[PDB]
PDB file of C-alpha atoms in Angstrom:
ATOM      1  CA  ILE X   1     106.989 106.610  76.042  1.00 50.81           C
ATOM      2  CA  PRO X   2     105.780 106.142  79.723  1.00 49.52           C
ATOM      3  CA  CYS X   3     108.682 105.534  82.176  1.00 51.24           C
ATOM      4  CA  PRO X   4     107.046 104.671  85.549  1.00 53.98           C
ATOM      5  CA  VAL X   5     109.324 104.279  88.599  1.00 52.03           C
ATOM      6  CA  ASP X   6     110.608 100.690  88.657  1.00 50.38           C
ATOM      7  CA  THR X   7     109.385  99.008  91.889  1.00 47.33           C
ATOM      8  CA  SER X   8     110.144  95.382  90.779  1.00 47.35           C
ATOM      9  CA  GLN X   9     113.255  95.024  93.022  1.00 48.10           C
ATOM     10  CA  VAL X  10     111.959  97.293  95.830  1.00 47.20           C
ATOM     11  CA  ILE X  11     111.019  95.329  98.960  1.00 47.80           C
ATOM     12  CA  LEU X  12     108.300  96.490 101.347  1.00 49.20           C
ATOM     13  CA  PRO X  13     109.997  96.091 104.786  1.00 45.94           C
ATOM     14  CA  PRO X  14     108.104  94.516 107.762  1.00 44.20           C
ATOM     15  CA  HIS X  15     107.860  97.930 109.551  1.00 43.15           C
ATOM     16  CA  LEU X  16     105.595  99.290 106.713  1.00 42.73           C
ATOM     17  CA  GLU X  17     103.192  96.287 106.376  1.00 43.92           C
ATOM     18  CA  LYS X  18     100.717  97.653 108.975  1.00 44.98           C
ATOM     19  CA  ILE X  19     100.538 101.213 107.478  1.00 46.50           C
ATOM     20  CA  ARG X  20     100.184  99.603 103.985  1.00 48.81           C
ATOM     21  CA  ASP X  21      97.065  97.719 105.227  1.00 51.44           C
ATOM     22  CA  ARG X  22      95.668 100.884 106.965  1.00 54.28           C
ATOM     23  CA  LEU X  23      96.102 102.890 103.738  1.00 57.32           C
ATOM     24  CA  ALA X  24      94.246 100.287 101.640  1.00 57.24           C
ATOM     25  CA  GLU X  25      91.400 100.254 104.213  1.00 54.07           C
ATOM     26  CA  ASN X  26      90.997 104.085 104.376  1.00 54.49           C
ATOM     27  CA  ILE X  27      91.305 104.582 100.584  1.00 57.30           C
ATOM     28  CA  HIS X  28      88.419 102.095 100.141  1.00 58.37           C
ATOM     29  CA  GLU X  29      86.204 104.050 102.617  1.00 57.30           C
ATOM     30  CA  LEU X  30      87.001 107.283 100.706  1.00 56.91           C
ATOM     31  CA  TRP X  31      86.246 105.547  97.372  1.00 55.66           C
ATOM     32  CA  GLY X  32      82.867 104.297  98.669  1.00 58.51           C
ATOM     33  CA  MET X  33      81.977 107.706 100.123  1.00 60.37           C
ATOM     34  CA  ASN X  34      82.761 109.432  96.784  1.00 60.77           C
ATOM     35  CA  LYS X  35      80.631 106.866  94.847  1.00 61.06           C
ATOM     36  CA  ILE X  36      77.716 107.249  97.309  1.00 64.64           C
ATOM     37  CA  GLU X  37      77.905 111.097  96.981  1.00 63.01           C
ATOM     38  CA  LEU X  38      77.686 110.641  93.172  1.00 63.36           C
ATOM     39  CA  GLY X  39      74.407 108.631  93.549  1.00 65.54           C
ATOM     40  CA  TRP X  40      75.864 105.091  93.483  1.00 66.85           C
ATOM     41  CA  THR X  41      74.288 102.216  95.465  1.00 65.91           C
ATOM     42  CA  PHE X  42      75.061  98.545  96.198  1.00 67.70           C
ATOM     43  CA  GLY X  43      74.169  95.871  93.619  1.00 69.46           C
ATOM     44  CA  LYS X  44      75.432  92.296  93.050  1.00 71.95           C
ATOM     45  CA  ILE X  45      76.727  93.078  89.512  1.00 71.44           C
ATOM     46  CA  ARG X  46      78.451  96.279  88.364  1.00 70.50           C
ATOM     47  CA  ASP X  47      76.160  98.453  86.184  1.00 68.58           C
ATOM     48  CA  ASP X  48      77.387 101.948  85.188  1.00 68.29           C
ATOM     49  CA  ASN X  49      73.870 102.839  84.107  1.00 69.58           C
ATOM     50  CA  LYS X  50      71.819 102.298  87.340  1.00 66.64           C
ATOM     51  CA  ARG X  51      75.102 103.358  89.141  1.00 65.80           C
ATOM     52  CA  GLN X  52      75.380 100.051  91.044  1.00 69.61           C
ATOM     53  CA  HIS X  53      78.661  98.535  92.272  1.00 69.27           C
ATOM     54  CA  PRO X  54      79.352  95.267  94.202  1.00 69.95           C
ATOM     55  CA  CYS X  55      82.391  96.803  96.001  1.00 67.37           C
ATOM     56  CA  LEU X  56      80.019  99.095  98.016  1.00 65.32           C
ATOM     57  CA  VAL X  57      80.693  96.794 101.010  1.00 65.11           C
ATOM     58  CA  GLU X  58      83.004  96.478 104.082  1.00 63.18           C
ATOM     59  CA  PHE X  59      86.724  96.075 103.131  1.00 64.48           C
ATOM     60  CA  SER X  60      86.868  92.656 104.884  1.00 66.22           C
ATOM     61  CA  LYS X  61      83.933  91.433 102.716  1.00 66.96           C
ATOM     62  CA  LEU X  62      85.288  92.620  99.336  1.00 66.91           C
ATOM     63  CA  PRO X  63      85.824  89.790  96.801  1.00 62.20           C
ATOM     64  CA  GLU X  64      89.453  88.606  97.007  1.00 60.49           C
ATOM     65  CA  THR X  65      90.586  89.917  93.568  1.00 59.82           C
ATOM     66  CA  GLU X  66      89.494  93.516  94.385  1.00 61.59           C
ATOM     67  CA  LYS X  67      90.754  93.260  98.021  1.00 60.45           C
ATOM     68  CA  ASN X  68      94.179  92.105  96.733  1.00 63.24           C
ATOM     69  CA  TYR X  69      94.186  94.897  94.088  1.00 64.34           C
ATOM     70  CA  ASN X  70      93.540  97.542  96.801  1.00 64.03           C
ATOM     71  CA  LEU X  71      96.423  96.115  98.905  1.00 61.10           C
ATOM     72  CA  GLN X  72      98.586  96.040  95.733  1.00 63.96           C
ATOM     73  CA  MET X  73      97.907  99.742  94.976  1.00 64.77           C
ATOM     74  CA  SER X  74      98.861 100.676  98.578  1.00 63.22           C
ATOM     75  CA  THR X  75     102.056  98.528  98.438  1.00 64.22           C
ATOM     76  CA  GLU X  76     103.050 100.130  95.102  1.00 63.45           C
ATOM     77  CA  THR X  77     102.560 103.675  96.498  1.00 62.48           C
ATOM     78  CA  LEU X  78     104.949 102.898  99.402  1.00 60.60           C
ATOM     79  CA  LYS X  79     107.373 101.053  97.027  1.00 62.23           C
ATOM     80  CA  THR X  80     107.332 104.155  94.749  1.00 62.42           C
ATOM     81  CA  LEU X  81     108.191 106.508  97.665  1.00 65.40           C
ATOM     82  CA  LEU X  82     111.083 104.213  98.682  1.00 68.23           C
ATOM     83  CA  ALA X  83     112.300 103.923  95.040  1.00 67.66           C
ATOM     84  CA  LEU X  84     112.291 107.754  94.685  1.00 69.85           C
ATOM     85  CA  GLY X  85     114.690 107.811  97.695  1.00 68.13           C
ATOM     86  CA  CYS X  86     112.098 109.363 100.077  1.00 67.67           C
ATOM     87  CA  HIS X  87     112.762 109.249 103.834  1.00 67.50           C
ATOM     88  CA  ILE X  88     109.903 107.673 105.809  1.00 66.91           C
ATOM     89  CA  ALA X  89     110.057 107.892 109.621  1.00 68.80           C
ATOM     90  CA  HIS X  90     107.490 106.999 112.298  1.00 68.75           C
ATOM     91  CA  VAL X  91     108.204 110.145 114.367  1.00 67.19           C
ATOM     92  CA  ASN X  92     104.880 110.304 116.305  1.00 69.81           C
ATOM     93  CA  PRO X  93     103.238 106.894 117.069  1.00 69.09           C
ATOM     94  CA  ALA X  94     100.836 108.714 119.473  1.00 71.70           C
ATOM     95  CA  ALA X  95      99.134 110.475 116.477  1.00 70.64           C
ATOM     96  CA  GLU X  96      97.224 107.175 116.031  1.00 69.14           C
ATOM     97  CA  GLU X  97      95.700 107.764 119.524  1.00 68.53           C
ATOM     98  CA  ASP X  98      94.004 111.044 118.448  1.00 65.67           C
ATOM     99  CA  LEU X  99      92.738 109.271 115.260  1.00 69.34           C
ATOM    100  CA  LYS X 100      88.950 108.801 114.810  1.00 73.27           C
ATOM    101  CA  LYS X 101      86.569 107.681 111.978  1.00 72.50           C
ATOM    102  CA  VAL X 102      83.903 110.164 110.778  1.00 71.04           C
ATOM    103  CA  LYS X 103      80.275 109.305 111.607  1.00 70.20           C
ATOM    104  CA  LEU X 104      78.489 109.877 108.276  1.00 70.53           C
ATOM    105  CA  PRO X 105      74.723 110.632 108.318  1.00 69.50           C
ATOM    106  CA  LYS X 106      72.212 107.762 107.937  1.00 68.73           C
ATOM    107  CA  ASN X 107      71.687 108.333 104.176  1.00 68.83           C
ATOM    108  CA  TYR X 108      75.294 107.244 103.411  1.00 69.05           C
ATOM    109  CA  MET X 109      74.192 103.692 104.362  1.00 68.81           C
ATOM    110  CA  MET X 110      73.653 101.172 101.572  1.00 66.71           C
ATOM    111  CA  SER X 111      70.995  98.413 101.368  1.00 63.76           C
ATOM    112  CA  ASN X 112      73.529  95.771 102.627  1.00 68.82           C
ATOM    113  CA  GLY X 113      74.086  97.909 105.816  1.00 67.78           C
ATOM    114  CA  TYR X 114      77.565  99.173 104.712  1.00 72.06           C
ATOM    115  CA  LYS X 115      78.283 102.842 105.578  1.00 71.58           C
ATOM    116  CA  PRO X 116      81.736 104.359 104.832  1.00 67.10           C
ATOM    117  CA  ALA X 117      83.807 105.401 107.875  1.00 70.42           C
ATOM    118  CA  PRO X 118      86.918 107.209 106.559  1.00 71.83           C
ATOM    119  CA  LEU X 119      89.416 108.727 109.014  1.00 71.10           C
ATOM    120  CA  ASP X 120      88.786 112.289 110.239  1.00 72.29           C
ATOM    121  CA  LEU X 121      91.879 113.934 108.735  1.00 74.63           C
ATOM    122  CA  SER X 122      90.295 117.475 108.934  1.00 71.13           C
ATOM    123  CA  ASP X 123      93.180 118.847 111.124  1.00 77.50           C
ATOM    124  CA  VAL X 124      95.933 116.926 109.195  1.00 79.21           C
ATOM    125  CA  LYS X 125      97.677 119.509 106.992  1.00 77.62           C
ATOM    126  CA  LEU X 126     100.208 118.734 104.221  1.00 79.17           C
ATOM    127  CA  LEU X 127     103.161 121.089 103.734  1.00 82.32           C
ATOM    128  CA  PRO X 128     104.431 122.036 100.200  1.00 81.26           C
ATOM    129  CA  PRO X 129     107.139 119.283  99.936  1.00 81.19           C
ATOM    130  CA  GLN X 130     104.489 116.604 100.684  1.00 77.99           C
ATOM    131  CA  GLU X 131     102.194 118.191  98.042  1.00 77.81           C
ATOM    132  CA  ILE X 132     105.147 118.005  95.561  1.00 75.24           C
ATOM    133  CA  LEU X 133     105.397 114.249  96.355  1.00 75.57           C
ATOM    134  CA  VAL X 134     101.598 113.962  95.775  1.00 72.71           C
ATOM    135  CA  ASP X 135     102.077 115.560  92.299  1.00 72.84           C
ATOM    136  CA  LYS X 136     104.945 113.089  91.537  1.00 72.49           C
ATOM    137  CA  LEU X 137     102.871 110.074  92.693  1.00 72.58           C
ATOM    138  CA  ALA X 138      99.941 111.201  90.474  1.00 71.97           C
ATOM    139  CA  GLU X 139     102.193 111.582  87.378  1.00 67.25           C
ATOM    140  CA  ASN X 140     103.752 108.181  88.119  1.00 68.14           C
ATOM    141  CA  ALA X 141     100.291 106.585  88.636  1.00 67.44           C
ATOM    142  CA  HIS X 142      99.320 107.827  85.154  1.00 68.25           C
ATOM    143  CA  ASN X 143     102.538 106.356  83.655  1.00 67.85           C
ATOM    144  CA  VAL X 144     101.909 102.959  85.387  1.00 67.57           C
ATOM    145  CA  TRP X 145      98.321 102.923  84.009  1.00 69.13           C
ATOM    146  CA  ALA X 146      99.496 103.960  80.506  1.00 71.35           C
ATOM    147  CA  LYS X 147     102.253 101.278  80.453  1.00 71.59           C
ATOM    148  CA  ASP X 148      99.679  98.597  81.454  1.00 73.53           C
ATOM    149  CA  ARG X 149      97.277  99.711  78.663  1.00 72.09           C
ATOM    150  CA  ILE X 150     100.119  99.810  76.079  1.00 72.41           C
ATOM    151  CA  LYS X 151     101.132  96.208  77.138  1.00 73.42           C
ATOM    152  CA  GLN X 152      97.472  95.220  76.346  1.00 73.24           C
ATOM    153  CA  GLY X 153      97.584  96.738  72.789  1.00 70.92           C
ATOM    154  CA  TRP X 154      96.063 100.208  73.453  1.00 68.06           C
ATOM    155  CA  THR X 155      97.087 103.264  71.329  1.00 68.70           C
ATOM    156  CA  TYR X 156      96.363 107.060  71.385  1.00 67.63           C
ATOM    157  CA  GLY X 157      92.841 107.872  70.067  1.00 66.17           C
ATOM    158  CA  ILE X 158      92.703 111.181  68.145  1.00 62.69           C
ATOM    159  CA  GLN X 159      90.377 113.042  70.541  1.00 63.33           C
ATOM    160  CA  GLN X 160      87.969 110.015  70.360  1.00 59.71           C
ATOM    161  CA  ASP X 161      87.842 106.920  72.616  1.00 59.83           C
ATOM    162  CA  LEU X 162      86.968 103.568  70.974  1.00 62.62           C
ATOM    163  CA  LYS X 163      86.733 100.318  72.982  1.00 62.48           C
ATOM    164  CA  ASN X 164      88.720  98.619  70.259  1.00 57.51           C
ATOM    165  CA  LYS X 165      91.992  99.810  71.795  1.00 54.23           C
ATOM    166  CA  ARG X 166      92.007 103.634  71.221  1.00 53.31           C
ATOM    167  CA  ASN X 167      92.138 105.936  74.284  1.00 52.17           C
ATOM    168  CA  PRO X 168      92.722 109.772  74.207  1.00 51.28           C
ATOM    169  CA  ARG X 169      94.251 109.646  77.769  1.00 48.59           C
ATOM    170  CA  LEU X 170      97.371 107.939  76.259  1.00 49.23           C
ATOM    171  CA  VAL X 171      99.296 111.250  76.296  1.00 46.14           C
ATOM    172  CA  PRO X 172     102.070 112.587  78.597  1.00 49.43           C
ATOM    173  CA  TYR X 173     100.641 113.469  82.042  1.00 47.51           C
ATOM    174  CA  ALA X 174     101.216 117.204  81.363  1.00 48.90           C
ATOM    175  CA  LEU X 175      98.849 117.158  78.281  1.00 44.82           C
ATOM    176  CA  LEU X 176      95.842 115.864  80.328  1.00 44.06           C
ATOM    177  CA  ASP X 177      93.089 118.312  81.227  1.00 44.26           C
ATOM    178  CA  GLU X 178      93.615 120.004  84.611  1.00 44.67           C
ATOM    179  CA  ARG X 179      90.405 118.292  85.932  1.00 44.07           C
ATOM    180  CA  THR X 180      91.918 114.862  85.120  1.00 45.92           C
ATOM    181  CA  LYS X 181      95.166 115.825  86.915  1.00 45.28           C
ATOM    182  CA  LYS X 182      93.051 117.065  89.887  1.00 45.29           C
ATOM    183  CA  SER X 183      91.102 113.796  90.185  1.00 44.97           C
ATOM    184  CA  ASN X 184      94.310 111.675  90.103  1.00 45.10           C
ATOM    185  CA  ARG X 185      96.074 113.979  92.670  1.00 43.49           C
ATOM    186  CA  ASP X 186      93.095 113.982  95.090  1.00 43.33           C
ATOM    187  CA  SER X 187      93.249 110.140  95.487  1.00 41.81           C
ATOM    188  CA  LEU X 188      96.994 110.166  96.318  1.00 39.98           C
ATOM    189  CA  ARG X 189      96.785 113.314  98.508  1.00 40.28           C
ATOM    190  CA  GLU X 190      94.451 111.488 100.886  1.00 37.99           C
ATOM    191  CA  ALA X 191      96.883 108.499 100.839  1.00 38.03           C
ATOM    192  CA  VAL X 192      99.854 110.746 101.870  1.00 38.90           C
ATOM    193  CA  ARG X 193      97.539 112.516 104.397  1.00 36.87           C
ATOM    194  CA  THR X 194      96.646 109.057 105.811  1.00 34.64           C
ATOM    195  CA  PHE X 195     100.401 108.322 106.320  1.00 35.11           C
ATOM    196  CA  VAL X 196     100.888 111.680 108.122  1.00 36.35           C
ATOM    197  CA  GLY X 197      97.717 110.993 110.228  1.00 40.18           C
ATOM    198  CA  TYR X 198      99.333 107.771 111.623  1.00 43.17           C
ATOM    199  CA  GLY X 199     102.367 109.911 112.675  1.00 40.85           C
ATOM    200  CA  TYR X 200     104.753 109.437 109.715  1.00 41.24           C
ATOM    201  CA  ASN X 201     107.062 111.994 108.188  1.00 42.99           C
ATOM    202  CA  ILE X 202     107.419 111.430 104.418  1.00 41.85           C
ATOM    203  CA  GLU X 203     110.239 113.610 103.138  1.00 40.62           C
ATOM    204  CA  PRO X 204     111.783 113.978  99.635  1.00 41.26           C
ATOM    205  CA  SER X 205     115.303 112.640  98.929  1.00 40.68           C
ATOM    206  CA  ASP X 206     118.544 114.694  99.227  1.00 38.62           C
TER     207      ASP X 206
END
């Protein structure tokens, strides 16, 4: 059923290692900001009631498993673009000079002193071909997730989720609700926007 893009024999080249790290860093700041907007706060153990999460901290002070997973997700996004035959070029290195973090208001600060500082990408526009790549990355991200769940024994749940291995999101990406598609797209749009903000062109294959 799910056929994600095979990245197993795709190598991340040395020239993309820095932008891979910068993407993982900014995507964490955006994740923390979204959680804090939704009423989440720092706590030492994750609790979905109470809305407390231990990853509401600086990227450098994340626990190593979660820090590695964030770097992995960034590496796999770049490996997917390469595997799709996309053309990545660092056309404007000086775009990093005009690149600033947003200063969030004092109430975005958590009890451990962490406050998100995502990049100000307010002037960074994506053109339609980059938005088409965002849609492809989101569909592929769903297929990667679905393959990983299927390899752990999960099965389609008939409208109803059940923590013994049934999930209703085990459908083709096109059969998801539009809100689900939106949420998945919005994460990867800000990743592609982050690439363009550091002065990269990211163009579809011929």
